[PDB]
Amino acid sequence: TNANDLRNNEVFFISPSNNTNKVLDKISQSEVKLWNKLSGANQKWRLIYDTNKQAYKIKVMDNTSLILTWNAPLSSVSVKTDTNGDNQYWYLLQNYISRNVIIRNYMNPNLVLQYNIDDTLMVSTQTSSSNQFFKFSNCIYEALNNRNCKLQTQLNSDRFLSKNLNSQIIVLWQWFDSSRQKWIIEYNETKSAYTLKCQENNRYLTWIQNSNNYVETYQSTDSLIQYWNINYLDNDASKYILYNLQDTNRVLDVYNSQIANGTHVIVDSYHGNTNQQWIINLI
């Protein structure tokens, strides 16, 4: 799959190459360690690419906004407040075939991240050894791919993404365990984004581009209007935003933040308010 590629603004588990069941874990306000995978937000990391530097910040997703930091001149690493220090940027360089990634410090590219036998991390000069190789797993792909899901608006604990009765228009409706409100989320390798298929009619969540900008269930198409970048909120891994591939500045949105059964769901410019936030759970 290409779902685990080192994309800007994607969120990952970062594992030692020798153990996919251990992940980089922010255990305290400053310390990181490899730990058994638990999928808490303190084990999730957002990549933020700096084009000028051709290097990334690696930000924990537990709400603290702290970033992976080499404690120069020492050999230790920590999470610290982002002060845009050169020691807070990392080159992420991938072996295309093995999928292993080297995490090399920007301030001193002689130094790479290394995991130790005792699960601690440090920086070190480069060897040929597996203790300096990491694998990246996209969190959302791991959790949601090929799963039957419900999508609740942040606006109301009992309002869900639902195909309307006797229409293709997609609306908010209270839960009644309907196949109209159940969506199979499937990653499409060609578009590098997701489709969401309504269980009731086997048609897909799709931006219908006219003055209304409603989403409807629509037949399978190659057009970008049917594909969605599902991401966590910038600093909250408990909520999602769905950006449409036809215009990635536009997102799945509840019309006028209304909560009434039948309220139109639309595609609208991103602003990040609660009517654009979705709680996705497995059925």
Ligand SMILES: CC(=O)N[C@@H]1[C@@H](O)[C@@H](O)[C@@H](CO)O[C@H]1O
């Ligand atoms: C904060 C908020 O609700 N903004 C909504 C916007 O997201 C979109 O739904 C639009 C539809 O025309 O109406 C606005 O009031």
